[PDB]
From a paper:
Here, we determined structures of the [name]-1 intasomes [name]/[name]/[name] and [name]/G140S/Q148H, with DTG bound, resolved to 2.5 and 2.2 Å, respectively. In the structure of [name]/[name]/[name] intasome with DTG bound, the guanidium group resides in a similar overall configuration relative to the Mg2+ ions, but the side chain is approximately ~2.5 Å longer, which positions the head group underneath the bound INSTI and further from the Mg2+ ions (5.2 Å), as measured from the ζ-carbon where the positive charge is localized. The displacement of residues 144 to 147 is similar when the [name]/[name]/[name] intasome is compared to both [name]/[name]/Q148K (RMSD 0.3 Å) and [name]/G140S/Q148H (RMSD 0.4 Å). The [name] mutation causes a weakening of the chelation by DTG, which, when combined with other mutations, also weakens the binding of the drug. Whereas Arg is the most potent proton donor, it is also more distant from the Mg2+ ions in comparison to Lys, which explains why its effect on resistance, at least in the context of accessory mutations [name]/[name], is less than that of Lys at the same position. Although Arg is further from the Mg2+ ions, it is a stronger proton donor, and thus, the Arg would also be expected to have a significant effect on the polarization around the Mg2+ ions, weakening the chelation by the bound drug. We observe loss of potency of DTG against the complex mutation [name]/[name]/[name]. We do not observe loss of potency of DTG against [name]/[name] intasomes, which implies that the Arg is slightly reoriented in the double mutant in comparison to the triple mutant. The only one of these triple mutants that led to a loss of susceptibility to 4d inhibition was [name]/[name]/[name]. Although 4d did lose potency against [name]/[name]/[name] (41.5 ± 5.2 nM; FC = 28), it retained more potency than DTG (P value < 0.001).
[name]-1 and other retroviruses integrate a DNA copy of their viral RNA genome into the genome of the host cell, a process that is mediated by the virally encoded enzyme [name] (IN). Each step of DNA integration, up to formation of the integration intermediate, occurs within a series of stable nucleoprotein complexes (intasomes), involving a multimer of IN and a pair of viral DNA ends. Because integration is an essential step in viral replication, intasomes are targeted by an important class of antiretroviral drugs, the IN strand transfer inhibitors (INSTIs). INSTIs work by chelating the two Mg2+ ions, blocking the active site and inhibiting the strand transfer activity of IN.
Author numbering:
A (entry chain C), G (entry chain I): 212 to 277
B (entry chain A), E (entry chain G): 1 to 228, 236 to 268
C (entry chain D), F (entry chain J): 222 to 268
D (entry chain B), H (entry chain H): 2 to 39, 57 to 139, 149 to 228, 235 to 270
Write the structure that this text describes.
DNA sequence: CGGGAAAATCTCTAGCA
DNA sequence: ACTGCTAGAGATTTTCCCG
DNA sequence: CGGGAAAATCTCTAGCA
DNA sequence: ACTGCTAGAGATTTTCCCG
């Protein structure tokens, strides 16, 4: 049910940048996806990233690797 | 510093010495010397040393024209993935651009196009094409190519590949399509070690899937959260922190001093 | 308020002071002698 | 790791595939592929005619997604260029043509050789009918037939929701290609691991299935046995 | 990988896929995929991402010409200090350059001049001027301005100052000399917070003083040092390490396993 | 030995392979078809 | 005598760069000055720097500050 | 810190200056300046004549270092341009001219006002004689008199070693200007510190001399007393 | 030992054309 | 065998001042 | 726990014209 | 009210493999 859905959302990865660092910050965990912002979880930490700074993939290689 | 300040402004009108030279030569604290510099219109000659960041939402495409062997190559890139669409067009005109764009909108989901201010892109016919397809147009600041940085870099990459495979074709149109193939499917790197084709598939598939998933979650998970305020809708809870939305302002407040109803 | 000095639109000469209307990340909107301009923050200085 | 037996029992009862067995019971997909083990690149081409012009139409058969355009003439070169464009835009493994002169020319064959497309000489007809219907609905919103053709392609790919799950052809083709990428990645993982030989506790040669961070899954005598990493010695044969 | 290697070279001849795409699509270790890339002449299109470093010895001067309002400004910079010498010259000719250079050699110690390959600098008359003054000429790699980076940056700085003080003069020659004044004495920064004039004075004074000092030290302190070898002349000793010179090779060996005689 | 590929002297086309004669910091001396060239290391690749 | 001379040499400062870092390394201590190289002492450490990478000043501001 | 009394005794015996007292006895130079306390910018200009041309010659009187060149004509503008060049190349505080028309023009005065040079209207003559002697020795190595003038300037500034320490004019001028920079820096330090007032152990107002890292030097009743930092309270008056 | 405020240091950009 | 740099704007980190 | 070797990551450049 | 980026070459750091 709702737990399965939430874990599914949490399988997706988020690459993101901060407002002054041009390096794309490595794969984080997707907690919530909105119209204007996504809420991620990067190394025991909950950031709010705007949508225009966020690349959300599933990464099929890692999904198939388990 | 009253005496020193008057001598330093007299000297700055002639020489425009920087703040250190004034602070040194007239006994002034750095803040006063810097103020004398900052009051001179003639010494404001340098911008702040940073770079902005272009929009990378799933629906943004950056368009540009480029030129090779006398022909005009119209290039689009999907910003999130690096996936390119390119065609040799007969001239740099709004009619060919509107056609390229309407094709692109029929091929992939396009929400926004981002171009420089070339006449082909600001044409009324391109505007009518965007209005029919539901595409929002965004025009960069004039003469700031850094704003189109993604597509300009894709220009460089596409020309490099065309130069690698030019001898395998006759007409430039064929070599361009070969290079688009090579970029989209035969070069892997970036975030998920993907090719651009794989990556765009993943980006768009993820967009659709997450959209549906969160639709179902919000449809099920309905609660209200108080913290410190009012009935702030709940987004996510877990690991000692709660994510909530109070008047379109998403804030992460810890579990303590936050109750869910 | 703020004084804005800027270099715009291929002219390598620096203009200003102008009034600041909006400050984003990467760009500002200035008001110089009734003209609204949009300038990258690489090409402006806000005082 | 512990739900492997549950997965085997589920496959014996219901014959579920590896996707459900790996998503419900939490298994590295190579494990589910072993349990179960113990199109997306096919396009249909065809030229069609309208207002005296030729409309070359490509159909991804698994999704119903269309790529159509007006070409100047029905020659080999034009078809081959359309094919290079299609292949550079999508994963194209196989094309289904109708023995027409353009579809058999030396140039189209050379382009399929360059792109690595296989050529093999009903859905195309019905899809052409749908395309001509939309082209008729929107011919008045445009002057040239090429613009109307692209408008119709847009309407068909993104504005016509049908099928079971109420999707457009674009959503469907994206889903199908994503599935195919998953398939290719799983096959690469299997091909990687299939060259290893394992010796555990020391028993006979066993086949490696996964080298997790806390366990090692193998398969001996058609039996999937989980053992620690220190208790097993992986080699390469 | 015998099967995989043959398919990957066949595919690379057509597409020129990078090493990752091959490693992924044909089961190859990264080293073999990278070798296939590194064997293709057609894929060698990028240099190593570094920058060299220009010589900054006390005697090196970097010369260049620059252009403003239709006139030719000949600019020299002392590399160690940032001190500039600039004159408006009537044309970009070897005769005016030899004269500027011979003046400079009479004003300051010049050992080496470093220029691009403009005709004024490679002229025979400049060569005769350098030979009379004892100046060694070093010519950068052609069309590599980064080699003249110091003087090119000084061009930018001098033009900026000229633009600040242009209205205080009539002829460009006067504004150029004013800007040279302003750069040499009214702008402080760099290593010792100095101006360029102070800094060049310090650099040259230090050169002379250290030369004499070490002359006297080596004249007094005469010993021989064995370590591990032969009679290696002693340079410096202290703090548990000894500095020595064994066959023009200066090595810092600790006090242990090193005896002074 | 070494293969050297280089871009020289304003020609944006990359040439080579050439033989490496000397390797400094910042520059190399190559031998391409009897010609000695001097190239910045930003503009060469040594294999 | 010789001790005074050596301390005098050691009053001079050396700014220097390493073969791949473009930042000029901060004020170090001059131990020896040769034709081809100078021997410095930077933060309890003895480096040998080539002359073309070494700016040697006395820095009169610090000398006057004591 | 402990050699301050030694410095006072040395100044009483020998009247040494602050340089020796600060280098031998290890004192922050403001301390030695207090003990002792209890030209380098002057240039001579003059036009000279040769082969019909005018040679404008500047002499740094303290060192004997020459800046000479052929000018087209003896006008104010030419002299003023020579002066702007000299001032941008060297620290020029004062120029000593000979009331000639060029040396008194409104343009030369405006240039001295811009550069911050003071104008005041034997060594110049002797130096001109030396310059003409070298110009004669090297007139044959050149075609134009301007080249020979610059050759002679080079020979005079760097190839003629004389004086006590066997130096050239260039070495001398560099030494003298380095000394003057030291002087200016010491004066800036003194001006900085002269605005502070100190109270120590709490005694009366004392004058600050140094705020070292382990001690604080002050001067009370013409007596230089060293105290710890915690034992004193610096303020600003 | 503690913050605050000021200095020092570090990061990063355009223009040199 | 030769070689990017310089100075300023803003951000971040260290140092000094009085408790 | 220890090195070695291989992978991953980080740093940094030109060209986009 | 908008905004440098991308991919490759080489260097450095982390991870995995068998003892
Ligand atoms: C007439 C249209 C509209 C108005 O402006 C002009 C001129 N222009 C100039 C460049 C250019 O200078 N590229 C070099 C570059 C420099 C920095 C960077 F970050 C990216 C870069 F690509 C273009 O690429 C380009 O497309 C145009 C163009 O189209 N137009
Ligand atoms: C005919 C002579 C001899 C042969 O080459 C040409 C052409 N050239 C071109 C530039 C130039 O492109 N500057 C921009 C720049 C770019 C990068 C960088 F690191 C430094 C920079 F200054 C010059 O400055 C210059 O002096 C010349 C010149 O003199 N010549
Ligand atoms: Mg453009
Ligand atoms: Mg462009
Ligand atoms: Mg030049
Ligand atoms: Mg130049
Ligand atoms: Zn100013
Ligand atoms: Zn290749």
């Amino acid at each position: 049910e709702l737990q399965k859905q939430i874990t599914k959302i949490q399988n997706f990865r988020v690459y993101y940048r901060d407002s002054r660092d041009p390096v794309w910050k490595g794969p984080a965990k997707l907690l919530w996806k909105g119209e204007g912002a996504v809420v991620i979880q990067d190394n025991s930490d909950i950031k709010v990233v705007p949508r225009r700074k966020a690349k959300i993939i599933r990464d099929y290689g890692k999904q198939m690797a388990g | 510093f009253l005496d020193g300040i008057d001598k330093a402004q007299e000297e700055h009108e002639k020489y425009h010495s920087n703040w250190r030279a004034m602070a040194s030569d007239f006994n002034l604290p750095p803040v006063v010397a810097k103020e004398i510099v900052a009051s001179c219109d003639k010494c404001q000659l340098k911008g702040e040393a940073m770079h902005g960041q272009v929009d990378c939402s799933p629906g943004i495409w950056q368009l540009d024209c480029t030129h090779l062997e006398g022909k005009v190559i119209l290039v689009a890139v999907h910003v999130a993935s690096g996936y390119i669409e390119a065609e040799v067009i007969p001239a740099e005109t709004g009619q060919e651009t509107a056609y390229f764009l309407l094709k692109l909108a029929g091929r992939w989901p396009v929400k926004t196009v981002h171009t420089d201010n070339g006449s082909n892109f600001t044409s009324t016919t391109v505007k009518a094409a965007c209005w029919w397809a539901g595409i929002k147009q965004k025009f960069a600041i004039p003469y700031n190519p850094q704003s189109r940085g993604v597509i300009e870099s894709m220009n460089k990459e596409l020309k490099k590949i065309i130069g690698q495979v030019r001898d395998q074709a006759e007409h430039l149109k064929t070599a361009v399509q070969m290079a688009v193939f090579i970029h989209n499917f035969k070069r892997k790197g970036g975030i998920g070690g993907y090719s651009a084709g794989e990556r765009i598939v993943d980006i768009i598939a993820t967009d659709i899937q997450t959209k549906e998933l969160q639709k179902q979650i919000t449809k099920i998970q309905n609660f209200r959260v108080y913290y410190r305020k009012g009935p702030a809708k709940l987004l996510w809870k877990g690991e000692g922190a709660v994510v909530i939305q109070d008047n379109s302002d998403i804030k992460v407040v810890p579990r303590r001093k936050a109750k869910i109803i | 308020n703020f004084r804005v000095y800027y270099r715009d639109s291929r002219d390598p000469v620096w203009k200003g002071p102008a009034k600041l209307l909006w400050k984003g990340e990467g760009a500002v909107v200035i008001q110089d002698n009734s003209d609204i301009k949009v300038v990258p923050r690489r090409k402006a200085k806000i005082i």
